[PDB]
Enzyme design. Structure first.
Site, PDB file in Angstrom:
ATOM      1  N   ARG A 112       0.838  -1.214   0.000  1.00 38.87           N
ATOM      2  CA  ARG A 112       0.000   0.000   0.000  1.00 38.87           C
ATOM      3  C   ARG A 112       0.882   1.278   0.000  1.00 38.87           C
ATOM      4  O   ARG A 112       0.731   2.169   0.831  1.00 38.87           O
ATOM      5  CB  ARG A 112      -1.041  -0.093   1.150  1.00 38.87           C
ATOM      6  CG  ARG A 112      -2.005   1.076   1.403  1.00 38.87           C
ATOM      7  CD  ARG A 112      -2.700   1.704   0.191  1.00 38.87           C
ATOM      8  NE  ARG A 112      -3.132   3.082   0.495  1.00 38.87           N
ATOM      9  CZ  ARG A 112      -3.859   3.877  -0.300  1.00 38.87           C
ATOM     10  NH1 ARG A 112      -4.291   3.464  -1.492  1.00 38.87           N
ATOM     11  NH2 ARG A 112      -4.165   5.111   0.106  1.00 38.87           N
TER      12      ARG A 112
HETATM   13  C1  LIG Z   1      -8.748   5.539  -2.704  1.00 40.82           C
HETATM   14  C2  LIG Z   1      -7.737   6.505  -2.129  1.00 40.82           C
HETATM   15  C3  LIG Z   1      -7.812   6.857  -0.796  1.00 40.82           C
HETATM   16  C4  LIG Z   1      -6.904   7.738  -0.233  1.00 40.82           C
HETATM   17  N1  LIG Z   1      -7.034   8.031   1.075  1.00 40.82           N
HETATM   18  C5  LIG Z   1      -6.177   8.886   1.674  1.00 40.82           C
HETATM   19  C6  LIG Z   1      -6.319   9.234   3.089  1.00 40.82           C
HETATM   20  O1  LIG Z   1      -7.247   8.724   3.736  1.00 40.82           O
HETATM   21  N2  LIG Z   1      -5.443  10.093   3.640  1.00 40.82           N
HETATM   22  C7  LIG Z   1      -4.436  10.652   2.943  1.00 40.82           C
HETATM   23  O2  LIG Z   1      -3.652  11.439   3.521  1.00 40.82           O
HETATM   24  N3  LIG Z   1      -4.253  10.382   1.626  1.00 40.82           N
HETATM   25  C8  LIG Z   1      -5.059   9.531   0.947  1.00 40.82           C
HETATM   26  N4  LIG Z   1      -4.884   9.248  -0.416  1.00 40.82           N
HETATM   27  C9  LIG Z   1      -3.756   9.897  -1.086  1.00 40.82           C
HETATM   28  C10 LIG Z   1      -4.126  11.301  -1.513  1.00 40.82           C
HETATM   29  O3  LIG Z   1      -5.021  11.156  -2.622  1.00 40.82           O
HETATM   30  C11 LIG Z   1      -2.869  12.132  -1.846  1.00 40.82           C
HETATM   31  O4  LIG Z   1      -2.062  11.451  -2.828  1.00 40.82           O
HETATM   32  C12 LIG Z   1      -1.976  12.429  -0.629  1.00 40.82           C
HETATM   33  O5  LIG Z   1      -2.717  12.449   0.608  1.00 40.82           O
HETATM   34  C13 LIG Z   1      -1.178  13.722  -0.834  1.00 40.82           C
HETATM   35  O6  LIG Z   1      -1.971  14.885  -1.080  1.00 40.82           O
HETATM   36  P1  LIG Z   1      -1.323  16.337  -0.922  1.00 40.82           P
HETATM   37  O7  LIG Z   1       0.006  16.254  -1.622  1.00 40.82           O
HETATM   38  O8  LIG Z   1      -2.219  17.288  -1.648  1.00 40.82           O
HETATM   39  O9  LIG Z   1      -1.283  16.573   0.570  1.00 40.82           O
HETATM   40  C14 LIG Z   1      -5.799   8.343  -1.044  1.00 40.82           C
HETATM   41  C15 LIG Z   1      -5.736   7.980  -2.394  1.00 40.82           C
HETATM   42  C16 LIG Z   1      -6.656   7.091  -2.955  1.00 40.82           C
HETATM   43  C17 LIG Z   1      -6.544   6.726  -4.413  1.00 40.82           C
END
Ligand SMILES: Cc1cc2nc3c(=O)[nH]c(=O)nc-3n(C[C@H](O)[C@H](O)[C@H](O)COP(=O)(O)O)c2cc1C
Ligand SMILES: Cc1cc2nc3c(=O)[nH]c(=O)nc-3n(C[C@H](O)[C@H](O)[C@H](O)COP(=O)(O)O)c2cc1C
Ligand SMILES: Cc1ncc(COP(=O)(O)O)c(C=O)c1O
Lengths: 153, 202
Positions: free
Chosen positions: A132
């Site tokens: 993951r």
């Molecule tokens: C299905 C899915 C669920 C996600 N859930 C989360 C989450 O719960 N928390 C989180 O920080 N990022 C999550 N991500 C990743 C974010 O989409 C993102 O790549 C990351 O948090 C960085 O965002 P930023 O650079 O704008 O802070 C998820 C991505 C996917 C595809």
């Protein structure tokens, strides 16, 4: 079904090459509305507002969608053209994000039906990986080239 | 899946509390076997008035707001500390639906964060330690090297860079669209300890 690995050695020079590949794989796997993207606009007080529009066309100048010129998003872009688009391809463990300026298309895009093209200032690619741990690459447009970086997931 | 999609939506099907309708929709999306019913697109805005988007998972919800966990050094967290105005969109377009929530993102308390953190499995708990989220990385080995490293970990401690945010419920929009119909579109707007409810034109 499942497509594995996104490494810096596999990256194309043109980010749209990667987009197109991903876009067509989404259609291949019969996702609902593979052309659907979420547009973020910002109002006069810094409030973000979101809705889904369809990608009608794209090239190196921008990504294109249509909307009503009297719509809430239409008005917001007039006051502030900075927008984000995101393709929610999480069914295939993917995101794509585009940062840019929305510019009204000309009348000859062929009354209150309209079109916008968002410039390509940044394009981020997200793909869900082993343990993951997602693969994230950001193309930043700079000096008629792209600077590319792996980002921590 | 068209069991749910078929009907229109009108004032007389709307509950007074919008989370009742959100919960209904969420449940249906789970029942309809949608990929990640709780995934929502979070929109933030930088210092320059430029919005940024990313998908996060909805962990908890109630009348105080909608909650997600994230890395506190990430791009979104920093953007939120400068501007707490956010938007959440639930992209349920397979069911021709959209729910968008407007409000303010406030940091969860440590003790809130401690509770949820403990409910997770040891894999995700170790997982939280690995990635300096959003930061520029030389290559994928850097993460994998550290992920493998953190298997020398047993009660799992909580990273100080791992927490979350509650987004308040200032506005909630429901959108029930379709094939060849005009979309049924309803805004719940919080005011004076009540919900002003209006149909919007599609
Ligand atoms: C299905 C899915 C669920 C996600 N859930 C989360 C989450 O719960 N928390 C989180 O920080 N990022 C999550 N991500 C990743 C974010 O989409 C993102 O790549 C990351 O948090 C960085 O965002 P930023 O650079 O704008 O802070 C998820 C991505 C996917 C595809
Ligand atoms: C799959 C799908 C595609 C959509 N495509 C568009 C579109 O191309 N243009 C558009 O104006 N609205 C589209 N909508 C409706 C928008 O999400 C939104 O309700 C509408 O544009 C009004 O937004 P605004 O009031 O924020 O301007 C679509 C909705 C769905 C579910
Ligand atoms: C505030 C408001 N909401 C909703 C409606 C329409 O409700 P419905 O078409 O669901 O019966 C109207 C019609 O005037 C209205 O003024």
């Amino acid at each position: 079904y499942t497509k594995g690995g996104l490494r810096r050695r596999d990256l194309p020079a043109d980010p749209l090459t990667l987009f197109e590949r991903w876009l067509s794989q989404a259609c291949e796997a019969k996702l609902a509305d593979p052309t659907a993207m979420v547009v973020a606009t910002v109002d006069e007080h810094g409030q973000p507002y979101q809705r889904i529009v369809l990608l009608i066309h794209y090239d190196e100048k921008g990504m294109v969608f249509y909307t009503n010129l009297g719509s809430r998003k239409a008005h917001q872009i007039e006051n502030n053209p900075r927008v984000s688009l995101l393709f929610p391809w999480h069914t295939l463990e993917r995101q794509v994000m585009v940062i840019g300026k929305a510019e009204r298309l000309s009348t000859l895009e062929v009354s209150f039906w309209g079109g916008f093209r968002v410039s390509l200032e940044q394009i981020e690619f997200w793909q869900g990986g082993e343990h993951r741990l997602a693969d994230r690459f950001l193309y930043q447009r700079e000096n008629d080239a792209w600077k590319i970086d792996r980002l921590a997931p």
